[PDB]
Amino acid sequence: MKIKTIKRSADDYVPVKSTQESQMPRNLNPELHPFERAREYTKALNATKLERMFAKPFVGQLGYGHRDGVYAIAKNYGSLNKLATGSADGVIKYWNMSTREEFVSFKAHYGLVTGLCVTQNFMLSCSDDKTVKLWSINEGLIRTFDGESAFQGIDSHRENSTFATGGAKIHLWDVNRLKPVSDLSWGADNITSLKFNQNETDILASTGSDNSIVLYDLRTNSPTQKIVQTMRTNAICWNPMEAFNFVTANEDHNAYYYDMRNLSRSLNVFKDHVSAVMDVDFSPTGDEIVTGSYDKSIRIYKTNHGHSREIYHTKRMQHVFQVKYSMDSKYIISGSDDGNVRLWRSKAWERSNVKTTREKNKLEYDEKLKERFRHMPEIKRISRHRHVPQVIKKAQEIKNIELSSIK
Amino acid sequence: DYLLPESNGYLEPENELEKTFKVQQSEIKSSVDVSTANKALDLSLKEFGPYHIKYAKNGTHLLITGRKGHVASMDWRKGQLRAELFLNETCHSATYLQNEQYFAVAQKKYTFIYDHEGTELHRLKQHIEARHLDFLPYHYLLVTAGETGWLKYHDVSTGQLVSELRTKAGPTMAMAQNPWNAVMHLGHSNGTVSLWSPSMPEPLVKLLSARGPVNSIAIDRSGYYMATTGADRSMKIWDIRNFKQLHSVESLPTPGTNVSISDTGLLALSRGPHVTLWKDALKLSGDSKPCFGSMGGNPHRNTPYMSHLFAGNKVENLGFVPFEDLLGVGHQTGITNLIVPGAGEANYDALELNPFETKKQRQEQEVRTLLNKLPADTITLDPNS
C-alpha cells in the first residue's frame, strides 16, 4: 500500500539567503498555459499602443543652423560623428553629432552652393559661381576647381581620391588636378544630380533635367544605358548594402527605385508623398528608404512594402530640400528650407539606451510578436497610424479623387 | 521535459489482496511528510451554517462561506487570517477575484466585493440573486448565476457590468467555468447545461446532460472532459472537444452533490456523506469508466481510487488545492482537507501562478495581469480562433 505525496520541501522554492532571488520553476505544459494566441495578442496590442505612446521622433537640431536654407548635406562616410551642411547663401556649416553645434563654418560662395561632397578631414563645396572649394576640418580654402559650367551638382568618389561635378556637363576632377580629366554627355542637356555607388564604386547614376536617367560607367568613359523618363528627377541614392540598385526621386510625387541590370522595369514605386520628392537616402542595413518632399514632410518606408510606415513633419520646418540617413542606421539628419538641420529618429520608439537584458529580450520578443500579429485589423489601426497635417491629408484626398477619376 | 523538477505522488495497491480505496485519512496522515500531512485542516466551526469552500487558483489563501453568516479568508498555510465577516444575511458562495486582497461573496440578494481586512468595497446594485459566483482572471470577469434566469458578467478591472444573459432556463442549479476556454457552463432542471459567452445572447451550445436537474458540473484543466452529475443518481463524462458523454455512470446510491476535477486527472464525486475520487477516469475507453465496484478484480472494470465517508455531515462543495494534493471539502460544521497522493500538479509554472509569492511580487503580477486582461468579446468557443 505505497503512499507517496507531493512535497514542495520549502527550501527549493524559497531560498536560504535573504539577498538571494527567488527560484522560478516553470512548466511549459499547454494545460497550464491557456492563452497562447490571446494573451500574446494583448501583449502585442500593449506594445503597439506603447509605441504610439513612444512616438517621440524629435531629438533637436544642429546648432542654430542656416538663416537662408539648407540645400545639400555632406556626410563623411567614415565619420559617424561629423557632418556638413551647405546653404544657398553659401555658408558651409560643419557639425558634430554629439555636440550638435557648429564645428567649423566658412563663407564659401557668394553664389549658391549646390552640393557638398567629401573626399580627402576634407570637404568640397561646389557652387553656382563655377567654383568648388576644398576645406579641411580641424584651415580654409585649399584649392578651388574652376569649371566652365555653373555647377548644378557634385559627387564624391572614394577610389583614386576623385570627385566629379554635376553641371551643364559632368567632368571628372582629381584632387591634384585643376582641370578635369574627362567630360561626358549622353544627351546634350544640363544634369541635375550625380551619384557614384559606394561598392563597385566606378558606376554612376546621372539624372537628366529633361526627364532622363542615365547610368554612367567610369570604366568606359561613356554611359552604358539611358531611359528617358516621364518627368524630371531630383536626387538619387545607391543602397550601401545591395550595391547594384538605386532609388531616385522624380518631379511628380513619386520615387522610383531601379535596378542596374534592368532599368526597363523598375524594382519598385513609392507614392505616399504629395509633392516633388527632393532627396532619398538608404539604410546601411539596406532596410528602409527615407525621402523628403517639396512638401513640408519626410517619410520612412521599407523597400519591399512600398507604403509609409513612418511619416515626419512638424511646425517650424518646410520644403525640406534634403534628408540624409545615418551611418549607424539609427538617426536621420534633416535639412530645411527653414535653414535648421534637425536630428530625427530612424524609429521614434527605438531608443539610444543600451538595454538591460531583461527588457532587451522583452523588446526583441515584443517586436517578434508584432510581426506575427501583424495583419490583424485591430492591430493594424494602431500600427499604421500617426498625425498627418491638414493640407497633406487633403492632398492625399485630392490624389485619391484624381486617381479615382482616372480609373 | 527533463527540466520538470518535481514529480507527482502516487498510491499503489502492492497486492490484489491489498486494496487502494480502503486507505483512510488518519492512515494517510502517518506516511505523508509533516508539512503536507499537517496541511490537512479540520476546521469544525459548528455554530454557523454549512460551509462553502474555495481555494484561490494559487493555494495561498482559503476562502470559506458558511450559510448563515461566515465569510473567512485565511492565509491558509500560515496562521494568518485576513477576513472574518459576520453578515446576518445568508450567503451561498465566494471567490477571490484577482488576489487575496479582493474577493466577492454571494449573498441572499447582492454580491459583495471586499477588502482583505473585511471592509466593504462594492455592493452590486445588480446581481439580485447569486448562487454561483465564479471568476476567470484572464478576463478579470466575475460571472454570476443566481436563482434568476439571467447571468451577469462584471468586469471588476473597470468595475462595470459587461453583459447580462437571460437563459429562459430558470434557476441555475450548477455553474462551472472553463479554465482552458473561459466558456461558462450553466446547469438547470431540465437536465440541460448551456455553454456561454457574454456576447452571444443565445447559448453557445445546449447539452441535454442528464435526466432530472443538474446537481453539478466540473471541468478539466485541459478543458477536454467535463464531469456532469444529475440528480438522477447519474454522472456523465462529457468530452467537450467533440461533445460526447464518454461514460454514463448510472444508479448511484445517492446523487452526488458536487463534482470536482484535479489537475493530473482525478475526479471527485461527493454524494454528501461520502467523497470518492477516481484516477484517470476521464480517458476515452469504457475501461476508464469510473465504477463503484469491479467484481472479480478485473483490470478492465475500474474501481475508485480514493474513498471517504463523512459521518455526521452532508458536505456542501469541494475544491482541490490547484498545486497540492488535497481537496477542501466543506461540510456542515466546516472544512476538511482530504489528502490525495497525486491530485494536484507537482511542477507549477511560476509565470502563470505563484504559490510562493511576495506582496511586492504580488503587486507586480497583478499589474501584469491587468495589462494582459482580455476584453470580453474575446471569450470564444476556441481560444485560438
Added chain:
Amino acid sequence: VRKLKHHEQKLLKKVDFLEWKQDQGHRDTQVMRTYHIQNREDYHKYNRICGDIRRLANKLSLLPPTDPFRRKHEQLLLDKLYAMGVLTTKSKISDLENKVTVSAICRRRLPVIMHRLKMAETIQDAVKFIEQGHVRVGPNLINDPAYLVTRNMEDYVTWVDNSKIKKTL
C-alpha cells in the same frame, strides 16, 4: 494600488477598484457614515421608498394643473410627509423631489433626534444608550436604534425611568 507608471497609466485607461459608477460614488456610505446605521440595507430601505415618493410626486406633476384631485392628493401626500417630519417645510410642492433624500428621512432617525436634543454628546453615544436600554418614546422603552420617529412623536422621547444615565443628568 501601485502609483503606477506613466507607461502603465495610458494602457489602463478606464480601470478602477475603489470608486465605480455602479457603486455610485459610495454616496450611500457617506450617509451610513453621518448617521451610523448598523446594516447597509437600511439605506436602501429608505431609498427604495424615497424614489417611491418621487415616483408618485412625478406623475402627480403630470396631471393637468387645476385638476381638483391633483391638488388634493398632493396635499394628502405633503401633510403625511410633514407629520413624519422628513421635510422641513410643507408650503412648496418642490420639496417632494428636492428635499426627499435618504439623509432627510435618515435625520428623522431616533439617535439623530436625541442628538439634536443634546441628551447625548455624539450620535453613536445615543445609539449606545438605546442599545443599553436607556431611552423611551412616551410609553415604550425602545431597544431598536433604527426607529423612525415622526415630528409629532418627537416630544415623547425621554430617558427611561430609574436608570443610571437619567440620574447622570
Added chain:
RNA sequence: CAUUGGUGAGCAGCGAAGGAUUUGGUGGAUUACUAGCUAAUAGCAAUCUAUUUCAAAGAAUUCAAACUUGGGGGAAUGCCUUGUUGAAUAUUCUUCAAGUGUAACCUCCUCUCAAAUCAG
C-alpha cells in the same frame, strides 16, 4: 460643627485547624431525555470491496419560466417588438425602419444639519 469623606491608625465587636478580592480554563443546565453510521424493512460499528452491477422504472408550457429594477430624463451604440427586405431549406438567418421601447448603455438627484465653531 455635620462631615453623613476616605485614608490613616487603632479598639470594642464578630470570629473552629485563615479572611477578603480578582480572574483564566473546563463541565452542567439555560425547550420535555427513544442511542451512532450507512446506500437503511436491512447490513455496519475490525469494512463495505473481488454481487453494487445487470434489471426495471425513469424526458410537456411543443422555447411558461427577473413574480425581484432608487427616481427623473434620454437611451446614441445593443436588445426587444411588430412594420418592412433578401437568402437557404412550413422555419432560422442577412438587411431596414417605427417604438413619451428598454433592470444593457449617458447624465441630474437620492450630501451641506435650529450639531458646533466663528468674525458682526
Added chain:
RNA sequence: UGAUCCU
C-alpha cells in the same frame, strides 16, 4: 487614428 468650437 480621427472629429468638434470662438474671431
